[model samples]
Target: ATPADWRSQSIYFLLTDRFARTDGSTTATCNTADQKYCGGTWQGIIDKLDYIQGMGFTAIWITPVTAQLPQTTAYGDAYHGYWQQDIYSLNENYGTADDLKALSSALHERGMYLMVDVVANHMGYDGAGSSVDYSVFKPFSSQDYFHPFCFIQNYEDQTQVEDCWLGDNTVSLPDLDTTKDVVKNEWYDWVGSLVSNYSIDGLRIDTVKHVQKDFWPGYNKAAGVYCIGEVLDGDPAYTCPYQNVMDGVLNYPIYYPLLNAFKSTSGSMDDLYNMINTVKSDCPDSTLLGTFVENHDNPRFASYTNDIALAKNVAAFIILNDGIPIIYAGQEQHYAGGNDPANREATWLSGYPTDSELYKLIASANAIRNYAISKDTGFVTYKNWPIYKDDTTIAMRKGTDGSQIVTILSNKGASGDSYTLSLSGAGYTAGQQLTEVIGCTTVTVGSDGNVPVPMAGGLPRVLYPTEKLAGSKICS
Candidate 1:
């Protein structure tokens, strides 16, 4: 069944080939640049459920499970799982079909959901697009299933972008002719069975913009689940359109500005503020969007600047904001790998440390969020109010008055001086005490209905009413 309350889920995203090995060996060498498989499997993920759940994530979004081109190319192996050759077959490199079923079962038993990544826009090809063997693919095993060979050179041309191929001669991703009735029908049926066969709760669709907008509505209906697509554009004008067709999108409109605002102390908060407001007004429901700072395709947050404090601020906004929080694997461990193969770091190398500062912060924020939801089941639907926006910081209040989480995020580095932000518009009573969930500190509201946020150590602050913390298990 579809996870109807996916908004309440805090997602933990991981690449199956890098998360863990079945043997649970942390000593294995993983050279990120090598772009080779690190042997992580479904059973390996199942074994680490406790570790994931311990950080309070309720869902896991894994790399694609479909079979990929069975050969090493200039782009290395299909270990990342995006290169799809056969739709019906499972990637045995990750695990068998039974192992995937076990993974879904494990998550469900723990009251969690499994969101599998899927690529419906294209099929993986080993070499040049024209030299591909169509018979090697599943169901759509003919030249008619794909568009004529042409590389995508112009992103501004929507028609060309939709029809053209994504890869070069070294490796090719054959664009599927989704406009064709037979191709669409096959996709509809394939996705439906895939969801039911593995009890998939949701889908994170790849290369969403590569397909025409009209194809998604029927495709989403066929899946019978919540589908979030990857629309990589930073402008809401471009990204928000996908939101109209699917349940939600990856929220790239926010990601670029977010990174720009928090990557360093010199970053701009004004640009981030404008983009946030733009997304809010342009997108259908921004709350359903995936809020994240790091992913498999981009550089790690830590890679831009080694400022742990800045990373915490980014993490705070992602969790406390009005959206589904998604933390990529190794993000908590401060893995600073840069781009593609580098961004997909091996988690086992980090020893899955629960003692890390970011990991603890994430757990605490999730605890506060879960507590708010327990009291008000509709907390996830609440609109976020930006009470304060400045050149260096942005503050927001989410949930109702009593259960509200007031998050104060700053781009100031750790060496930043102590200052105070008096937020009179954030709905706080005079003398009311609030608990800073991240650091478990206390703050008393001023007499003028002002919530005075004292900034020190340049860390982000997530405050909840002190009275509400009694049963929250956060600083209780």
Candidate 2:
């Protein structure tokens, strides 16, 4: 089967409610009473196209746009776009159907792809002590459209995990019984029409592990797009199951491990090596894995790698690694929120320009990855010793041809450390001048092929093959 072009693009994940609110005058004051709609509308997102595209992201992933339940829940509102109530209509809170089309057109004109979030497993008003009331919902409002409600009493039981309600008891989003033929047909029709009508390039399925496995192949075939299922488990055994049904996953298994690998107390570069080997041998498509350090659901990357120098190294790894890179909003600004709603803060609040040094580094890293992909470079791994894995000092080299690149990071709370790193496996000879891409500085390789990395405070260094040595192969 031929893969969709979207599979290779770098993804920028945004939560619509927190991204921007440009058209405040058009909407009524959000009733604090109803937790379903915050101030974010489709027009708000459309207004920020230049800001988003200017960052060099090839695709954008927005939250679900379908109308959600009306009642308020314990957690703010369904503004995060998961608690969908009606699949047929667009969420008025976001904007009208026409506004959605305009957003798509603007994105396409800029050569950017749009991936729409979709909920296919189940739907109903969700909040504290809330339940599905058929009278208000039309069409398949009857109980037949949903599975019987069951509370998840234990996490160890796979059956309950697949059949139970996800949120707290107050806001109840029931899981659908896809085993029912009627439900299966309705789901297929709903998702199929959604993709065709919106011209969505991809689908980000929410709460995927909560649904029956047997139903996915049919649902995915009907949707007809590049689909990535969310299975929020930290272990590969649990996450790998989704591969049995969907084409790709969010790759949380590798996410946390990568984060921990750079922390002061976590294991060394060897740990990262082990994780990569596992993914390559176990995962169905390791190259398609969604590589990310910070996401909507987790703490900010800065919170973990507090040193700006160390954070730069982590960012570089995500962009150059062998997979589709994803960066959450506000990452470039170095937002330090700890979790969820807090981590979902607006990007504009930071007051940074699109051309800042942070963003320039991101663009440069992305350019390197795109260049490598175009060359069909084989899977590459680190060929040097890690500088410091105990307290935020991390470094490694990755390349495929005779060329090699080195990255070093220092998150050590105090900084001011210098170390010599040796490079091997890429035919490096002594006394070669290796260029540092980000800084435009050149260092001479010693007779032993070791490069000296001098640090004043926590900072990052990106070393690449100098143009003089790269000949006609280096990508600018």
Candidate 3:
């Protein structure tokens, strides 16, 4: 079956190995501080769906489900699901294949969607003493399915990017020869089978650029559902090419600019508005791209600055932006670990604070968006014509003439100066009472047209039409 309208959905991304433990295990014995399995399972996720749903997330992006190499790597273990050894079988560390099916069923029953990650590029690492015998790979064990051994030295050089190995001694990944017809057909069949067997709503294609650019269209077509690829670069040209082939591409290009503007003191918040406009100018469909503030690959936003107000502003930008908003597992709790394993801290450590300031901000923003879209799909349409933005302040109205959304975000704590925000032809009548859904208050529009937006508060304010105010879930 085809996937649902992805534009209206908000996704929650979680690493299967670090989320939760199953079988009534109160404590996960595996060390989360280091690499290796942390004993998180599909049943664990099934048990914790309430924690995610409470934040208003409607979709999930999980790590790879393919079986991993049993042999321990020098770094630690294949706990994070990147290391693949078999195609047909499910990762025992996660649970049996039935467990994954149950997870899919559980999500569907609750009106949620599931997006599974799959590695089509490489497999288990072959180090000294114990080399990959190749006989262990499930369906395609023949040497022809993979590229001959080589190292990825330069991304500027196309051949190295396509045919070279990814990791070092501890986790060297064998590249796949995706250019081959046999390899392409094999992967196409394998992924089609996986999605069909599990009723997956979408797929997050791993290491997309590692294969030939031409390889993605057929792969996505075979999967027959929403497929998002990780182009893994910040350049618009580099990321846009893959979007033409797949359903969507991770908005890494915008990801870098957002971090620089919001997190890095060197950058300006005004650049964020410019970046969103740039995406609309460069990409095929900016609305379909995935927008996020934090994910597993990048450092947590709190690592850059722990100000709760700053985190609240960033969360508003993510939820109100044009793409399908993605909140990584621990983002709601404000996880602040620095680098890879550090950035990938267990959400359990934070006890899943569903009622925190950031959590309310997320739930309130999504409630406004979903409510707007339900009235009209284009109610979530993004526009910046009369935008008010500066180095530390940004605001815009996204919606149509019938219904609209007004969002004002300030990185700086508060602006002593008051200003008139005009909503001239943006679905507002004169003297309409515009409710600040995020701030949980009521403010009136002027007799002329401009609304009096108080900038003294630290967090952002999302205003909806007075008649549709009941649609917004009140947030304080």
Candidate closest to the true structure, highest TM-score: 1
With a 3 Å backbone cut-off (N, CA, C), the pairs that clash in candidate 1 are none
* lDDT per model vs. reference: 0.89, 0.68, 0.78
Tell me the tens digit of each residue's lDDT in model 1 across 292-319.
Answer: 9999888999999999899889988888
Q: What would the per-residue lDDT of candidate 2 be over residues 323-429, giving only the tens digit for each residue?
A: 56788878877788777666776665654467765677777676555554455445232323233343445565556544556666544433556555443433456
Which is the better candidate, 2 or 3, if ranked by TM-score? Answer: 3
Off-target runs (Cα >4 Å) in candidate 3 are: 1-4, 23-31, 126-130, 264-266, 380-386, 414-427, 471-476
Comparing 1 with 3 on lDDT, the higher-scoring candidate is 1
Q: Taking the tens digit of each residue's C-alpha lDDT, what string does model 3 give over 170-267?
A: 56787777888988999999989999999999998889988888999999999989888888898888897788898888888878877766663345
Off by over 4 Å in 1: 1-4
Query: How should the candidates be ordered by lDDT, best one leading?
Result: 1, 3, 2
The Cα error of candidate 3 at residue 362, in Å, is: 1.2
